[PDB]
Design a protein around this ligand. Sequence first.
Ligand SMILES: [Cl-]
Ligand SMILES: [Cl-]
Ligand SMILES: [Cl-]
Ligand SMILES: [Cl-]
Ligand SMILES: [Cl-]
Ligand SMILES: [K+]
Ligand SMILES: [Mg+2]
Ligand SMILES: [Mg+2]
Ligand SMILES: [Mg+2]
Ligand SMILES: [Mg+2]
Ligand SMILES: [Mg+2]
Ligand SMILES: [Mg+2]
Ligand SMILES: [Mg+2]
Ligand SMILES: [Mg+2]
Ligand code: NA
Ligand code: NA
Ligand code: NA
Ligand code: NA
Ligand code: NA
Ligand code: NA
Ligand code: NA
Ligand code: NA
Ligand code: NA
Ligand code: NA
Ligand code: NA
Lengths: 172, 29, 156, 142
Amino acid sequence: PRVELEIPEDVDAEQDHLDITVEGDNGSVTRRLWYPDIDVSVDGDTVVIESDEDNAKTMSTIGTFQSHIENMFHGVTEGWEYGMEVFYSHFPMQVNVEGDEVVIENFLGEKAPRRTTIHGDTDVEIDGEELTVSGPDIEAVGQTAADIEQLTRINDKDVRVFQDGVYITRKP
Amino acid sequence: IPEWKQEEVDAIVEMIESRNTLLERALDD
Amino acid sequence: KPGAMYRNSSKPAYTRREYISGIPGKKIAQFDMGNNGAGPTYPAQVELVVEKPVQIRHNALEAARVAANRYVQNSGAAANYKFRIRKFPFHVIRENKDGMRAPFGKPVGTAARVHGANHIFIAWVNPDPNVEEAWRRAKMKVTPTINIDSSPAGNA
Amino acid sequence: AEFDADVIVDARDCIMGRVASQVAEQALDGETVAVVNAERAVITGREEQIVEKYEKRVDIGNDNGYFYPKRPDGIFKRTIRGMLPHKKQRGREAFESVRVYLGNPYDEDGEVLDGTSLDRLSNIKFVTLGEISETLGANKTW
RNA sequence: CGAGUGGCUUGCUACCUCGAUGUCGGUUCCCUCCAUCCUGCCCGUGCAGAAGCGGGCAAGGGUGAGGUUGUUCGCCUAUUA
RNA sequence: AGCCUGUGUACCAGGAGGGGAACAACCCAGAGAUAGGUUAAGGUCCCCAAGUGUGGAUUAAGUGUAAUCCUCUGAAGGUGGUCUCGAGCCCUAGACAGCCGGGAGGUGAGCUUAGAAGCAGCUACCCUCUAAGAAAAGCGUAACAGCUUACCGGCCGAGGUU
Ligand SMILES: [Cl-]
Ligand SMILES: [Cl-]
Ligand SMILES: [Cl-]
Ligand SMILES: [Cl-]
Ligand SMILES: [Cl-]
Ligand SMILES: [K+]
Ligand SMILES: [Mg+2]
Ligand SMILES: [Mg+2]
Ligand SMILES: [Mg+2]
Ligand SMILES: [Mg+2]
Ligand SMILES: [Mg+2]
Ligand SMILES: [Mg+2]
Ligand SMILES: [Mg+2]
Ligand SMILES: [Mg+2]
Ligand code: NA
Ligand code: NA
Ligand code: NA
Ligand code: NA
Ligand code: NA
Ligand code: NA
Ligand code: NA
Ligand code: NA
Ligand code: NA
Ligand code: NA
Ligand code: NA
């Protein structure tokens, strides 16, 4: 099998060994794409993913490499953004960006601030009760958004009653 | 060889006398 | 008592009631189920086939049958289908319940000997195989692994 | 320090067992062998089960003792010892004329033995001795 | 109803010892197993909370003092995570 | 039951030597001494004599590398893990999936019921417009609304489904 991905005019993709880097006006993302007998190479205007095997396990990874690269094309141009919404019922939750990590205070009245560290070059811009997580690396942005939501996870009590927390509102 | 498709290409050609593929079909007639 | 004790056919056939007394009655309630008034005049005929020669205690037959027919009530108490368990527990089984002295056991029950590939159950249905399910439940209560086989039915 | 090796073998990206088997055979033939870059040697399989085995060996023991090595250094040497009758005179002589090294203290670049190399491009299920030692608690002195 | 795992009980067998492998219970002192009682981290709930019930990972540590009985076991009391 | 008790046979007992990690009866093998040679069972990556042998395929679990067995467990049941072979049906007159749009009126059918309007229960389930559209397959409402399946059209482009 062999798939060809025509790279966007807006982008440049280089690759040595098992590492591929994609640069665009919005940034640059480098990934490792390592799998038995799957070659990824940059043939001028198109990135090529090929292999001499067609077994199910191989086709699975080929399809995965594809979406991974296309996702990079998108991240270096249009970019990736997740929208979030802070929400509380009794205690005013305070979500601030301090350093390279987002801090949440007064969660359910908690005295101890809850926090999490942002992944890579991901921007977490907060405006009122709305958050926007963005960047060129979907992996990083996706996790940062997720971690934020996970950060308000509660297991001790009934979630249906205690719904406070920040949640992903819009997925790219 | 679906028949309903064959009949449509006819009905279409009829109204042309007095799906897109079926219209383009009739037109080819 | 576990089936481990009686599922094998390693003992001589022991079925002569003229020389054996005190044989417990069978727990199997019926052998003909559904519309026994009608004859196999159905489109589809599925069978539960045993895949290994084994002994099946009347205990397992009843539970297997009930679990299948009690379920075939996805069609209704007077539904249109007929169910048949073709085997009967002829083999009398003993237990040595003194130690190994004068150990010939006393009669404790009965079992049916089924050879691999025979059909123990046969159902007759119109294209409405809920019976295929009644059997997934039936071979669940008998020792052997089983094959659910359909005969008259090219309506796939 | 200073080892007149008649043969210097490079273990980088090679199957530990297949190298060991050959280094054993050669030492019993009278050759003085040195295995280089032990930390970069490799063993195929699922890292999780592989590590469980070696971890079990570390935990095994008692007063009589079962000294199992943690550094890629000894792991490899013990591996070779298992392919030699190390308690017989001949066996101990051969074993003592074999030494494993972390990295390469020599000037020459060791040679790659036939049928011991692993192609990283067609293999994903394998582990580095160095990684194993790190898991075991070894002090990454390399 | 069906299929199993363990080798703590009981039974079976009679392989080992009758030129003897010192009994039950207790005690003291050491190691271990997990099918987890508590503790850690979790899932479900007929999960509002609190208090629970059930389940998963998990053997690091803990799992105590007493009244009757030779008792093992077990019954009972007050403490206890 | 490494149980008890028959039977036929070969073996141990009273049977070496080779193999099986060890091991009375499993495999080869029945054996004067000494010597050269070739095989048997079994084995040829190292320990360990002989292949890191050849053509091809499967397995990712260290499954497995365990003839036989007290000794080598692993079962009923389950598996869109993966490989191979077959049959039926659909498809460039554009299939399967997804996304976008349409899902219309007589009409909120009649009946019962304050009520009931696709959807409490009962009966029926007709015809119009049309390229589609149930007298409504699933939610939802006090009943409506709202959200969707069926059904049609578009985008897309190659196999898909049982
Ligand atoms: Cl030790
Ligand atoms: Cl030795
Ligand atoms: Cl691999
Ligand atoms: Cl002889
Ligand atoms: Cl292993
Ligand atoms: K004795
Ligand atoms: Mg609570
Ligand atoms: Mg003594
Ligand atoms: Mg456990
Ligand atoms: Mg302990
Ligand atoms: Mg004798
Ligand atoms: Mg040799
Ligand atoms: Mg194994
Ligand atoms: Mg076997
Ligand atoms: Na007696
Ligand atoms: Na069964
Ligand atoms: Na290996
Ligand atoms: Na040890
Ligand atoms: Na004695
Ligand atoms: Na004692
Ligand atoms: Na513990
Ligand atoms: Na007491
Ligand atoms: Na003899
Ligand atoms: Na031997
Ligand atoms: Na293994």
